[PDB]
Amino acid sequence: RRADQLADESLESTRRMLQLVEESKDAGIRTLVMLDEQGEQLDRVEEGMNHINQDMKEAEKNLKDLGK
């Protein structure tokens, strides 16, 4: 009676829970995919920094060969 109204509210709560954790699962997977892609971008950015440093050694040598 009241017990049926409450058992129904409990059931519906468990359905909402299931939806919430399924959405959380989809968000978590997409987040991890983004972090992985962003990680490869940072690897490229660091590679770039290292390349600039090495190029600058060559530039410096060239300026010295120019008497500068």
């Binding site: 709560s13 971008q41 190029d55 530039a59 060239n62």
Partner: protein, 64 residues
Amino acid sequence: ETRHSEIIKLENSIRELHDMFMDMAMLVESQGEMIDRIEYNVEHAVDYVERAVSDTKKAVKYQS
């Protein structure tokens, strides 16, 4: 009324968890836009420095 009240306590915790996952996804996406712009700046910086090395090398050639 007891199982009902405890089930509700559980739903509240799961909603907190869900909302944190949703927030984590949004923040990672936004930060990714900033990384796109850092990467763009770095690619253009690399190119400018490569051009500079090449041009100083040519100036040495043209002396030498």
